[PDB]
Amino acid sequence: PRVTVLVREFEAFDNAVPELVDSFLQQDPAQPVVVAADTLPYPPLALPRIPNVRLALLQPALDRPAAASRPETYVATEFVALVPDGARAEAPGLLERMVEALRAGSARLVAAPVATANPARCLALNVSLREWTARYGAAPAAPRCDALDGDAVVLLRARDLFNLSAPLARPVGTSLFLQTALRGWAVQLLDLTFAAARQPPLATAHARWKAEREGRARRAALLRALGIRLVSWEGGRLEWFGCNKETTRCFGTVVGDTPAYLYEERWTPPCCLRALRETARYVVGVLEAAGVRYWLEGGSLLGAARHGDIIPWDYDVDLGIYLEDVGNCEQLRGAEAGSVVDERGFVWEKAVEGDFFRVQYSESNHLHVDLWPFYPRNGVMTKDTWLDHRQDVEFPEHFLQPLVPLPFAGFVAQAPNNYRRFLELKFGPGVIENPQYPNPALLSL
Amino acid sequence: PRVTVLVREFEAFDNAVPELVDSFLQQDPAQPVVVAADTLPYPPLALPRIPNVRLALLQPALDRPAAASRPETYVATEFVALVPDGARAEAPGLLERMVEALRAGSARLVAAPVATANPARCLALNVSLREWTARYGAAPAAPRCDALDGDAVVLLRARDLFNLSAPLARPVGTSLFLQTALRGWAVQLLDLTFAAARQPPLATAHARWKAEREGRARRAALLRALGIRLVSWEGGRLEWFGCNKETTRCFGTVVGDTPAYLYEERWTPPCCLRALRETARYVVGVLEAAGVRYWLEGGSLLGAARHGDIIPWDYDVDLGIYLEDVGNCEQLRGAEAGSVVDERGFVWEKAGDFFRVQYSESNHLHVDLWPFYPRNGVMTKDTWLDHRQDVEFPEHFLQPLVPLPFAGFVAQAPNNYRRFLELKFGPGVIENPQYPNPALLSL
Amino acid sequence: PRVTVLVREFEAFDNAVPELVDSFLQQDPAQPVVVAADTLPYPPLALPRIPNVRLALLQPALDRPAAASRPETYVATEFVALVPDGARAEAPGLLERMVEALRAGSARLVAAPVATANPARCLALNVSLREWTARYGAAPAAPRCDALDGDAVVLLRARDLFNLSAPLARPVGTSLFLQTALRGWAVQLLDLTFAAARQPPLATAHARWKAEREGRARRAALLRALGIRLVSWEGGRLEWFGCNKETTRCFGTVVGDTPAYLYEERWTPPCCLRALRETARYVVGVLEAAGVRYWLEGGSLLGAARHGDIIPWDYDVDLGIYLEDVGNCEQLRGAEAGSVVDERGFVWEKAVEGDFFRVQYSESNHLHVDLWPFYPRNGVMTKDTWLDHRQDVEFPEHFLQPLVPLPFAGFVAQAPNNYRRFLELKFGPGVIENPQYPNPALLSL
Amino acid sequence: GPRVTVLVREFEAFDNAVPELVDSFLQQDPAQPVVVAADTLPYPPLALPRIPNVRLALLQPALDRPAAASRPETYVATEFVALVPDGARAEAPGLLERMVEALRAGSARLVAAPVATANPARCLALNVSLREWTARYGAAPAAPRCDALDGDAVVLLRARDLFNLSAPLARPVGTSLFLQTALRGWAVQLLDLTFAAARQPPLATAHARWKAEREGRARRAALLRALGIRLVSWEGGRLEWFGCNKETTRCFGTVVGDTPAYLYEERWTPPCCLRALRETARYVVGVLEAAGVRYWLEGGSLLGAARHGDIIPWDYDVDLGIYLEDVGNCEQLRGAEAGSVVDERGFVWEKAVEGDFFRVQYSESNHLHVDLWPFYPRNGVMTKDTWLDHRQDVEFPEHFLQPLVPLPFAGFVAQAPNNYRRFLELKFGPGVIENPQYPNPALLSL
Ligand SMILES: *[C@@H]1O[C@H](CO)[C@@H](O)[C@H](O)[C@H]1NC(C)=O
Ligand SMILES: *[C@@H]1O[C@H](CO)[C@@H](O)[C@H](O)[C@H]1NC(C)=O
Ligand SMILES: *[C@@H]1O[C@H](CO)[C@@H](O)[C@H](O)[C@H]1NC(C)=O
Ligand SMILES: *[C@@H]1O[C@H](CO)[C@@H](O)[C@H](O)[C@H]1NC(C)=O
Ligand SMILES: *[C@@H]1O[C@H](CO)[C@@H](O)[C@H](O)[C@H]1NC(C)=O
Ligand SMILES: *[C@@H]1O[C@H](CO)[C@@H](O)[C@H](O)[C@H]1NC(C)=O
Ligand SMILES: *[C@@H]1O[C@H](CO)[C@@H](O)[C@H](O)[C@H]1NC(C)=O
Ligand SMILES: *[C@@H]1O[C@H](CO)[C@@H](O)[C@H](O)[C@H]1NC(C)=O
Ligand SMILES: [Ba+2]
Ligand SMILES: [Ba+2]
Ligand SMILES: [Ba+2]
Ligand SMILES: [Ba+2]
Ligand SMILES: [Zn+2]
Ligand SMILES: [Zn+2]
Ligand SMILES: [Zn+2]
Ligand SMILES: [Zn+2]
């Protein structure tokens, strides 16, 4: 015996795990079987009390050694077969068939759908940790996959499963293939099918609703724990798991111009980018309706010139405006006498710090558009207040007459004319073609 | 004679860990030092990036192997010293001395106070997983101790620390000694003192208020994760970490008359028992106020007779009442039309031919009320449960009723209640406690 | 007892280091392992990326602190085991047993062979820095050795290894025991054998050949860097690493008559002396066959009188000749017209400075014999030029009438009669019995 | 008690004024700590005063010395270290603590005083990019605050900062010190204090200077190679190269797993290697345009052109597509099928191992190359008979080549498929231009 059946995805209140376990022992009484749980499942499972059937409780406990919560402790065979609840062994010799498939193939995982209502389908999957995004889609090399959707027995070497960081994190159907796809591993969907339980679990609308609410709750906690802020299907059907109008932003107070996600070797969370685009769009719309001359500035102008979007590691949006136009905007003139929360939840405020305005996504989510007011004195756009940035600099007004439409972050914003020049004056030649982080620093990148 | 300094207790927003680490590096530039954190601390700690100083991130990650979060894999030496933030090495050799004490003494752990505003004090500590309770007190054999309260450098063998199930769970001061005391290990509180940092962390009242709040949240999550519902102290102070009026009870629906906690070799969570005793005292009060004749029944009577309280694995309270006084109680009158939530949050229902009073709308810990009526001097009812002890009984057992301490108050019980309990449960029931369904699980 | 495995001796292009590391991890998953290299090995070593296995790069780097290239900072354990490529921990607890022998014995190093085609041998070793010589032999008190030859696991305290000046210079088999034997330390060769790799490295004849080539290059660079000119073995076999006919001599131009090696508290390099003795022999043979009367002069005669050889810190060879005889010698005849390279590559020249001749070992190697022509005036040998040496004096011709045989540099040379009186006349009384450096006012014995 | 250790590292053994240097500092304070550092014992002898505060630090390994003997911090007991070049002399008393006081009261971690030689220190700007293997020098925008110095200066900094560098005394210190300090974001303040020149300066003849300069340039070239600086520039120009060229091998060995060695070193392609690829691309394009072979930028080269008009900074070759029916118009290509062909300009044209493609190597020794992939139109889809394990090696509609479009690339104008943006996304996926990635992300990520 070289395969250990391991059952992780089931619900204590309604399962067919005893039928599952029995079905395998009917084919081999010596079959190693591990049912894994965080706490002792209740009502009792009453699995057969034989040495090859073991219940693995994986949460830490005051009375148990460190090994007791490590799943590899309970597996002494070369391969592990992850079996979902609802499956049943009916035809004999099917785990051996799966081993021979995995031996002969080039994929580190092999899988056989279970004949449930939701049998496994083959999926493509890329994990971008820099972008906190998991991108799913149809599998162009089926039956060679990056991930599975639905019910399948998945077999792989124990050494591969248990060297992952979160081998049994729930839902397995999500956490396993996120880890295996990131490592460039593939799973081969075999033309073998496991039968379904004769008494399938969760066979009522109410039990299914309970299971799905808990399943979705575990998935949401799993993606947040692992830094997946966004799930997409074919670039759409977007599923968010980050910040929003009602939460704080994902990273909070930046020190040394280097936000926390850079030290995590990632870029700006996509929920944060989404909020910045929406605030930029809203603020631009407000200034255009009020008759405020604005133009993309600093990193926003640079990002618009390079790829027409926010630079993917940047953390705010900066606009220049004519200072004499400020009185035209109600939120702005309100923001010079104190903090203003407008009809749509955006907070307009004048950070007395550097003599500029700041518009935050909401009272709790402090992703902001900074507005830098400019006034001409002897033909140059210049303010008697600056900060320690190379690109906080005076510039001749002719860059602003006329202004130019430039795509930026989903809409068309205004830019200085000859913006390519303009950007080279402020950042240096070749800046559009040579990306950079905001402050190297005594470390990496 | 090699010892790794291991730092776990610090706040990312306000810490003195750079000074801590640099102070040890002053005594030995190659001192092995491990800073452990769940997530990457920000603002950056900006530790010296030298091979002997390492940052151990303990949470799972899509792009790291299982080993990357296992702390023993960062520690190669025989001994480890847990150093709290705010501490510092000044005089040389203090770790070597603590090693010397460990090898000469008999305690598996040695410790040295840090001269902060909360230097470590010695405490006794008794852990009862079966009762979800940890009990602290003053240490009779100090400086031999079960646990510590306050700041100390703790040194032990790495094989000892890392074979624990949760060696670095926060707060370490709570988590560590719960696990070591449960094993019968002692900590010896040595005479050595570590100096405090010169620029101590949490210097403003605002900052320590933040730290203590987040410290309190971590401790509550820790105790819930590891099955401590109650912390008690000599002197009577009680710290609750379980259910209450606004939560669910701690255990789900009971199958086979055998609750989930018994299969975990544990008894009723002490918070659930507290709720039951509170519901018992309230319902009794309402019934006496309304003039309803009640007596303790079933397991409540048994526990009252045996030790004047709820049987420690029991999960409800049972009272008999006279059929005919039901109408005297407003809540009971209403409970027959439908579910009544009275002014104190209790939920009166009828459903069975008995009444049920639940602690609250969310907490379904309940007192069951069993109405009986006399037929021929025999107390009877019209529907029956599949319980040996659910039977008719002579009414003279109610004529009269006797005062009996139960669950903190004086209840009413049948006269000759030991004979009463023997009639329903069988002989010797008081002296021979048994789980509710020994066919499934027996005590 | 905690022990860090430290791997230094391997080749990037062909090794069994992953197998080595893996085999120790199979006995303790948290085994601390340090792989040391001067540059990042490419192709990638692909060690398990786990915190207890670390790669230490011993190169300077602009973005790393001093500590990153100092290997002691990677070793936290009391003990360290140097393990060569091609070895494996197959038996549980071999390092522990090596640790116990170290504490029980008196040797600072303990060693275990590995069952390769060349398991470690026990050797004696004396190091003489002053003579630039390392002398190996059979070990008189085996299993206690000064040095090993072949593959072994070598265990010692980290404090002892990393207090050495060059703990990990390659080849470690040579470098380590030069340093430990010079310090009087012993290495006890235990009766413990580590296994060889299942796939040993260098399975082909081409890579086995390419490894020996880089090894010998590393070995020669090591001994030159450390000042070992000569390695000898019982059996007489000699390995040289200094002068030859085709290179320059080891030391540059001598100022103050005090060569650079003397200031380093060493004597003349053994290759330089060898060249001088072969040049003296050759020149004597030329002058004798030419019928040129010659005699041992200056420091050569003094050395001959003391012990029949060159003074061990001396840097040339001196012979006096009769001036009227130079025309008898073909090489001397051409030398007056210009530089002459003769049948054996020796270079005969008439010196710029003082009316004397000089014979260089070769065109590139300027170790030389100086020929001092004298002529008789009134029974007194004289010349028209004079050095600022006290022993550069006239002398009576009867000292040359006749000459006496005197062994020098492996052959029999002609010397003045009464050479004791001759030497004392030129150097002052007691010179034979009182060795002194050529310029005691700058550097004395 | 003195708080500065004078440290002398830049001098020549055959010709120096280090004895005069040491004596001048001892004349202001006879107890002044003075360290002279060398790899080997300097010969002729320096014959420094045999007092305990004057020490020779030999920084090479030795069979009879402890580890500490070759570490420079072993020789310094003071908080501060003054790096003093040969040719300086202390005549004004107390200058060393004016430098200590200036460094304490300022914000630069280094301060420096010029030495009044013929080459007095000038303030410089310096940007070090390890990823691009480049050191960019220029005029200092915020003088007297600098990133680097050129010329002779006493440089004072804390021992803890100097000796925590990886190569604190690597020669030339004028190069190695500031490459390390500028990489860390440290500044050096050129103070308004002057040190006097040696009364009898070293290297006073042309021949002595010529020997010193040849040795110095050899140490500088070895230093830059060891430290991974392939290119030095002054104001973007005056390029100075220390990498590969036409006569050497390329900088990185044979690539395995599509991931060259420089990626594992957390670096991008060496700039010498990129230069050779741009030269070979321009040459090969020039040859094919002259011979009448239709070509187009392909693969990573087309992708780099569309994004920023150059080779992608971590890419290792250039790929062009050609019409197979045009191969016969190029002499070098028709010879490539029969065997390897070195053309008159040193480029090597070969037909592939298997793969039915052509490879043009920069030179016989330097195997950076332009790969040429020929296709032909089956039913209007361009195809080849064999394929690669890469995602982007597929067929494509022929209309993407009727017409071809100009596109700037690598310093010249090359031909691209029309609508190259859509062409790129079909082969690589949507958004490829706006989202850059590495060749094998599962092994090594950007
Ligand atoms: C995943 O990434 C690959 C990159 O090779 C790309 O070709 C593929 O289309 C991507 N799939 C999704 C669904 O984004
Ligand atoms: C992780 O991989 C190593 C190498 O195969 C293996 O020996 C080890 O047992 C694996 N770990 C677990 C927990 O399975
Ligand atoms: C722990 O149990 C002992 C009896 O063994 C008891 O005396 C002690 O008081 C308990 N500990 C505490 C803190 O109550
Ligand atoms: C647990 O203890 C054993 C025996 O001392 C030891 O071998 C093992 O390494 C320990 N586990 C750790 C340190 O994680
Ligand atoms: C080493 O020196 C000892 C003592 O002088 C001597 O007895 C022995 O022969 C020497 N061994 C070798 C190999 O030269
Ligand atoms: C050198 O030995 C001493 C013991 O005297 C020890 O303290 C020190 O750590 C050692 N140095 C190194 C680099 O191991
Ligand atoms: C160095 O980098 C800065 C910041 O990008 C730039 O402004 C400056 O021009 C650069 N200087 C040189 C000489 O490259
Ligand atoms: C590096 O700096 C620390 C102070 O931060 C100092 O203790 C240490 O000695 C320094 N290292 C060296 C080699 O000078
Ligand atoms: Ba910006
Ligand atoms: Ba009960
Ligand atoms: Ba001589
Ligand atoms: Ba390419
Ligand atoms: Zn966000
Ligand atoms: Zn409770
Ligand atoms: Zn020699
Ligand atoms: Zn190159």
Numbering used by the authors:
A (entry chain C), C (entry chain B): 47 to 491
B (entry chain D): 47 to 397, 400 to 491
D (entry chain A): 46 to 491
Sentences from the paper on this structure:
To understand the molecular basis of the unique substrate recognition and catalytic reaction of FKRP, we determined the crystal structures of the sFKRP-CDP-Rbo complex with Ba2+ and the sFKRP-CMP complex with Mg2+ at 2.23 Å and 2.60 Å resolution, respectively. Since the enzymatic activity does not appear in the presence of Ba2+, the whole substrate remained under the Ba2+-containing condition. In the CDP-Rbo complex structure, the α phosphate residue of CDP-Rbo seems to interact with the Ba2+ ion in site I. The loop region from Leu433 to Gln437, which is visible only in the CDP-Rbo complex structure, is involved in the interaction with the Rbo moiety (left gray loop). The CDP-Rbo complex structure suggests that the metal ion at site II, which could not be observed in the crystal structure, also interacts with the donor molecule CDP-Rbo. Upon CDP-Rbo binding, significant conformational changes of FKRP were induced in three regions: the zinc finger loop (Gly288 to Cys318), the Rbo-interacting loop (Leu433 to Gln437), and a C-terminal fragment (Pro481 to C-terminus). The most significant structural change occurred in the C-terminal fragment of subunits A and C. Upon CDP-Rbo binding, the α helix is unfolded and Gln482 makes an interaction with the CDP moiety of the CDP-Rbo. Moreover, a small hydrophobic patch was formed in the C-terminal fragment by Tyr483, Pro484, and Leu488 interacting with Asp303, Leu308, Tyr309, and Trp313 in the zinc finger loop by hydrophobic interaction and a hydrogen bond. These interactions shift the zinc finger loop toward the CDP moiety of CDP-Rbo; the shift was especially large around the residues Gly298 to Pro305. The hydrogen bond between Gln437 and CDP-Rbo seems to further stabilize the Rbo-interacting loop, covering the bound CDP-Rbo.
